[PDB]
Specification:
homodimer; three-stranded antiparallel beta sheet; 9 helices; globular; binds fe (iii) ion; oxidoreductase (chains A, B)
């Protein structure tokens, strides 16, 4: 029953910023891996009929690890696109200006958070409870939904598997390149959703 | 200032099990990077003149993260060598037999926890305080000394950088290959010292 959601673009679509190779390993291997392990762990428990998010919300241990990673990855693929990147636009542009001063303030702060996360984890743009954009970081499979720290708008995966093929130990160049990939229309979809609450 | 202790072998001495390319990034980028970064963090601080192990035992935060990783990597490199691997011999052969039934019991339990570790971390063979060999796992920069959980005898790095170049997402092949590299002498020397107390 839990299926690996489809990419909205081709395996080559993020090149040269993230490679076709990477997306093959990250999506066809790692991401699919979390779906298959989750389906195994929940087959005959209370979790089998519950939704991905409910699982994420109520689970712990190995089930949460795989559940959250599935959700995190889907959010990550949708956080990017071909023909995306550069300056923001629409509502998210106006809110990033309001809540961080300027786009440039946000980008640098986000990049620094992304680059200094120790070990495996994620960076997030999130809407907190003051109806305010906020930069978070989570470790491993952690998630702002689980933490109740904010409603996700964008995410960027900082596990070594997300860049190691293309960038080796050079996380900073992966981060730089990711800005060419950021999908502002997903961000806008999420901000409108998130404001409704 | 703390230094990057030389390898006991050549860059390509662990191939084909761990390639020369991996060792180059793992040792010359990752491991050195931890050295340069710790030197800068302790520069003008109470720790500027303490030994690696004292910093490991006494600190937290980014300082702990870098010190612990220099230590954990040197132990990792010393845990391996060319013309090693295979069955254990001497004191470690015997104590493993006693504490786990047989070598194959240990190798399978140790492969399982090495493969099972979620996110970044380390597998350990250690002497616990009941004078018993046990398998420990630590997350991120953690080691058993800091944790007072045991005396390390052998370690194996599970961060994706340790294997991603050679094995991609296939952690289990890296662990299978690692068995061809296990330095039982280093193990023996550690058990002797450890058993002395
Ligand atoms: Fe990932
Ligand atoms: Fe490492």
């Amino acid at each position: 029953v839990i299926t690996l959601p489809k990419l909205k673009y081709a395996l080559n679509a993020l090149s040269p910023h993230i490679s076709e190779e990477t997306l093959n390993f990250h999506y066809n291997k790692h991401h699919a891996g979390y779906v298959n392990k989750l389906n195994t762990l929940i087959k005959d428990t209370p979790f089998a009929e519950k939704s991905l998010l409910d699982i994420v919300k109520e689970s712990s241990g190995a089930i949460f690890n795989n559940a959250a990673q599935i959700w995190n990855h889907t959010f990550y693929w949708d956080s990017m696109g071909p023909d995306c990147g550069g300056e923001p636009h629409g509502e998210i542009k106006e809110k990033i200006q309001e809540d961080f001063g300027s786009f440039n303030n946000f980008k640098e702060q986000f990049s620094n958070i992304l680059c200094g996360h120790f070990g495996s984890g994620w960076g997030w743009l999130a809407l907190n409870n003051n109806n305010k954009l906020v930069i978070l970081q989570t470790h491993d499979a952690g998630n702002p939904i689980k933490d109740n720290t904010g409603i996700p708008i964008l995410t960027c995966d900082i596990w070594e598997h997300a860049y190691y093929i293309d960038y080796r130990n050079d996380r900073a160049s992966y981060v730089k390149a990711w800005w060419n990939l950021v999908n502002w229309n997903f961000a806008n979809e999420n901000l409108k959703k998130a404001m409704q609450k």
